[PDB]
Design a protein around this ligand. Structure first.
Ligand SMILES: Cc1ncc(C[n+]2csc(CCOP(=O)(O)OP(=O)(O)O)c2C)c(N)n1
Ligand SMILES: Cc1ncc(C[n+]2csc(CCOP(=O)(O)OP(=O)(O)O)c2C)c(N)n1
Ligand SMILES: [Mg+2]
Ligand SMILES: [Mg+2]
Lengths: 663, 662
């Protein structure tokens, strides 16, 4: 079913990609040269996607995990009627809609921001996860309201990365059938031939994960690829197709070598490659009207008709199942139920609750009030208290279940939460220990680059963890996460603060949120509720004292705020003026006005002291030149948590000694 | 042959672990109880290890990747004579040599610190890699001076982690035949049963990696395990042995559950369990002298004879290959050849070079002069310029090769560098892009906790990468690394700074070093070489000016130092006093005398300003309440690198405008 016109379209894509890279004198020709046939077959024969109707909720989700092949994607998006030839001509240039690695929200049709290898694949696992769960919740007899595939195009670097192993295990265990991977196997990487570091059977590996495997012997044979995709679509497990291609196909002097991977060909080699393709070298950025026409008559019309039929089905779904239809529209919009906050827990004085336990209570409330809430833990739900006890577990037999068992796969869990957030219809969260945030720190960065409403529960935040030792006690993680732009790192001081931090995490549509929680019982603070909501939303607020300019201004976060307050009292009892300020979220505080910033932390107070059970880094911004920081400068210790905390300076008397000794 | 005395030994190990966890009211009984037979078989019958002579270089290296089974290890170390019973009676207590997870250098005979899952397994891969490379370099005919095995005890969680996939791929591709993994397959995890998140075929997976597979069906059958280990030692690839064990075996009511995984048994269940073991529930911390005798007659005698033969073989080695034996001993001592730095590159005024290129020049000198240098890149050696051009690539056929090809395996690479540092005899190094330093951050943390002389080459450090875009352009990595205790993060300003940075990196016997290098060309500065060598070592030094208190103190790291210098000059000819300061390593500067710190960054100068193409976080410590931080509080952009740098404010004119606005 493939003609010479189809080959003309394929080689047009290749020529376009390399003219783009040639103009920029920057880019990666190899993968776009080698993958153009399978990408063409996918887009024109299967993919239900219109890059113009970029938000069709039942659209197939295609992800290019190999971000360095961005040109190909852009070329595709141009011949499908969403991206101009001028943006291609402005490749890797300032302000362009065609950045070097594909970016979400910047280019229409780019579903997730890719580049860092393996992450696109795991985010695609997350997208398919969201698909299965939403279908399990909403679909009825003859009302397949959620039914679409998840396609990903990956390279050798993707499968050399362990996050691929983690995500593929999770996908095969839960039988995510609508996930299809197209693996460009070119036996070449950046530094040379793949047989220098890689030698393994993708077949046996992925069949051991529970996957289906298909081998395409010639990546240029469009028919073999088409059959592989169709079979993969009719199968019960996740499926990977190892399309065997030659990197830099068409180039005589640079094919099958590392040189074509990430360096421009040059006009000489581009000329010879064009000769091999049967295209005019002298004409640049040329696309035949037949090429545009083919995409118009195949993918675009098919996607339009799928969207139209889905809209009709939904109009009937609203009549037969009205409540579900309203809830589904609210889910797609990402809006939260009105007055959901009104059912969130109120903690009263005399309560001594760990931030993880109070988070668990709030989560019990959120699963009831917000039907889009979805997530789980990395085999630490007993320790993270991230389970909904009134809900079932997600599985192949129970796709509607609202608790996910990610397993000891934290990086993949983060990328999966990111893919779920990119999919839409869900409010996703993932849980682990704060000290193991380091495992998924790349995912977090992508979440902050894309601006995903993903929430990351991190418990066990300090040396108060205790007996589990320095490997399990965080010191430097808060500062690293605070350094990530657009990252809400909220460390609540008590249960009420935890509730408001959850509210921030749910309503933050453009900002990912890490919740840094504790395992030790924290004291509930006598700050009225009004002030807590406002102050957690503004990052830092006064919890004790009325004098804007005092002798002593004590800054604290999380487990320390109560301690700070205690110290304040003693200072007051010896004729010293003092104010105690909680700083749950530094990001929110730096978003506020200079007036509020100087009302909470006047730079006029020279004796400013901060107290945190973490690294000092970043605190001298808020204490000044003549202020002091009481923190942890080394690693932790294996001993009961109270003892470790006391030995590391965080006792009221040592704070008093430090504060009174200062100037 | 296995007597009932061997069974008494195994059950004494179990009882001792249970009692330690009971007294601490903290810890994990499950892995001790279930894997005591296999640990006993390996330690008493195969392991050439004396915990008392913990530094015997040809010892068999054992790693417990399942740190939560700490008690078991401690019990072994107590029956082997290295650890006192009174230490086990202080499990997870302040100042004890028995912390909750195994800690290297804090307890005798713990080869690496574990607890974080998968990292012990990958560090074991790195240990075996060091073994093979040292054997390829030093072993001669009849002089097998490096010939020992690397064993690792691992759990289900170690294999769900992707670092395991990476490291096992590396080990199967490179035929690390002397690596044996014992996999505790209890089909149970912390949150519950393994069938709720995990369903793989370990045999198919690891045989796809290029590994050998063995299945021990009865985890309590010591002879099955003995035969498994003998066969694993005889095979030509890395071997995993799946040992099917019941988690918390011997407990009537808690066995086969996730509850016995991380909670003390309780005294009631303890009594019932001791009855199943045939032990007296009244006696606590009771080891029969038969068990001590078994471990004395087996592992200790054999390990000491092994070491005696090794010492004699080294004495003969020194006669037959003197120079090579002296180099072997210097490598074991962890020392550097004297006057090595004399052969290191010198860059002069008018040199414009990227930190990766001058790095590579230095590296090409180091490998020639420092014979213990070893490392490679994660498929970026062409970019990082970490390749030793005069040398061969490491492989199964050429284990003497000094260039390692890790592939796209950053976390496994950092863990392998750490294992090499632990092994001894190597000066291991790693290389990738700074932005992907996050892929190996957990390994960096353990490098810092353990105090390993590891060196991590991080190139492409700023928004000057350019067209690759925001996901490949570092912003916040510098700050997250600088917060890691015991981590030397060095950002050289020119190539001379890069040479001194490499010297510090190699001479840092107890602190790991991360080198942050630039893709774009940096100009060489007019500071004299002595000032560079002193200042990079002291972490901060003045590169421009003479007045201790000027009107303006410019602070910078790397690419912007020169920028600051130029700005200073213009500032000067608008009638101001300026001093420009380079801060390549904060860890070194904080380590100095306050007198020096005030001489370089005085608190008396109100108008202090920092210029660094990274996050602001951490810089207000040095610019004070009234200073300014010119940095980046957002992500990067895909465009020609110079254009990104200029659009992000890092031109001389924007610095002058903001500085005179202050
Ligand atoms: C985690 C990560 N490490 C490193 C890189 C840099 N990088 C981009 S492409 C590449 C080569 C990997 O080869 P492959 O993906 O097989 O490329 P192909 O030949 O198909 O173009 C590398 C190291 C990256 N993007 N992400
Ligand atoms: C990276 C990381 N994530 C989580 C933990 C904590 N944790 C969760 S499950 C688990 C046990 C994994 O081994 P498993 O096979 O479940 O152990 P067993 O049943 O033999 O005790 C650990 C240590 C950890 N130590 N490191
Ligand atoms: Mg490849
Ligand atoms: Mg287990």
């Amino acid at each position: 079913m493939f003609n010479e016109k189809d080959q003309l379209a394929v080689d047009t894509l290749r020529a376009l990609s390399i003219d783009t890279i040639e103009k920029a004198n920057s880019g990666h020709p190899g993968l776009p040269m080698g993958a153009a046939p399978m990408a063409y077959t996918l887009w024109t024969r299967h993919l239900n996607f219109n890059p113009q109707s970029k938000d069709y909720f039942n659209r197939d989700r295609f992800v290019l995990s190999a971000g360095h092949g961005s040109a190909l994607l852009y070329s595709l998006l141009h011949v499908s009627g969403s991206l101009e030839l001028e943006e291609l001509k402005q490749f890797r240039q300032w302000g362009s809609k065609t950045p070097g690695h594909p970016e979400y929200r910047h280019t229409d049709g780019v579903e997730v921001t890719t580049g860092p290898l393996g992450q696109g694949f795991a985010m695609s696992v997350g997208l398919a996860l969201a698909e299965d769960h939403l279908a399990g919740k909403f679909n009825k007899e003859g009302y397949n309201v959620v039914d679409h595939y998840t396609y990903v195009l990956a390279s050798d670097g993707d499968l050399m990365e362990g996050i691929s192993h983690e995500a593929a295990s999770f996908a095969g265990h839960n039988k995510l059938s609508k996930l299809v991977v197209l693996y460009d196997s070119n036996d070449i990487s950046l530094d040379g031939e793949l047989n220098k570091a890689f030698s393994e059977n993708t077949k046996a590996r992925f069949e051991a994960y529970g996957w289906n495997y298909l081998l395409v012997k010639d990546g240029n044979d469009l028919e073999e690829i088409d059959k592989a995709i169709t079979t993969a679509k009719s199968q019960e497990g996740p499926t990977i197709i190892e399309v065997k291609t030659t990197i830099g196909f068409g180039s005589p002097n640079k094919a099958g070598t590392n040189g074509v991977h990430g360096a421009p060909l040059g006009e000489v080699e581009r000329k010879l490659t064009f000769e091999n393709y049967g295209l005019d070298p002298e004409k640049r950025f040329n696309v035949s009207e037949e090429v545009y026409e083919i995409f118009q008559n195949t993918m675009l019309k098919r996607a339009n008709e799928d969207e139209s039929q889905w809209n009709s089905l939904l109009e009937k779904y609203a009549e037969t199942y009205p409540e579900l239809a309203e809830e589904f529209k609210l889910a797609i919009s990402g809006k939260l139920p009105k007055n959901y906050k009104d059912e969130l827990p109120r903690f009263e004085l005399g309560h001594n609750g760990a931030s993880r336990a109070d988070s668990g209570t709030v989560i019990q409330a959120i699963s009831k009030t917000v039907p889009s809430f979805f997530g789980g833990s990395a085999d630490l739900a007993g320790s993270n208290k991230s389970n909904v006890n009134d809900a079932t577990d997600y599985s192949s037999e129970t796709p509607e279940g609202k608790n996910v068992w990610f397993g000891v796969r934290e990086f993949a869990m983060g990328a999966a939460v990111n893919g779920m957030a990119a999919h839409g219809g869900l409010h996703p969260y993932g849980a682990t220990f704060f000290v193991f945030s380091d495992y998924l720190k790349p995912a977090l960065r992508l979440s902050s680059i894309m601006g995903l409403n993903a929430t990351f529960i991190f418990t066990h935040d300090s040396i108060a963890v205790g007996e589990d030792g320095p490997t399990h006690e965080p010191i430097e993680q808060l500062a690293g996460l605070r350094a990530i732009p657009n990252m809400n790192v909220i460390r609540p001081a008590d249960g009420n603060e935890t509730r408001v931090a959850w509210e921030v995490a749910l309503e933050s549509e453009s900002t990912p949120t890490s919740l840094v929680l504790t395992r030790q019982n924290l004291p509930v603070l006598d700050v009225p509720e009004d002030v807590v909501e406002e102050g957690v939303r503004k990052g830092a607020y006064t919890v004790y004292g009325s004098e804007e300019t005092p002798e002593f201004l004590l800054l604290a976060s999380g487990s320390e705020v109560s301690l700070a307050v205690e110290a304040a009292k003693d200072l007051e009892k010896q004729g010293k003026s003092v104010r105690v300020v909680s700083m749950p979220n530094w990001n929110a505080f730096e978003q506020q006005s200079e007036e509020y910033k100087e009302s909470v932390i006047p730079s006029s107070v020279t004796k400013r002291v901060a107290i945190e059970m973490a690294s000092p880094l970043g605190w001298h911004k808020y204490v000044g030149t003549a202020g002091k920081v009481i923190a942890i400068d080394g690693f932790g210790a294996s001993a009961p948590g109270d003892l470790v905390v006391e030995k590391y300076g965080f006792t009221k008397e040592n704070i008093l000694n430090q504060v009174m000794s200062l100037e």
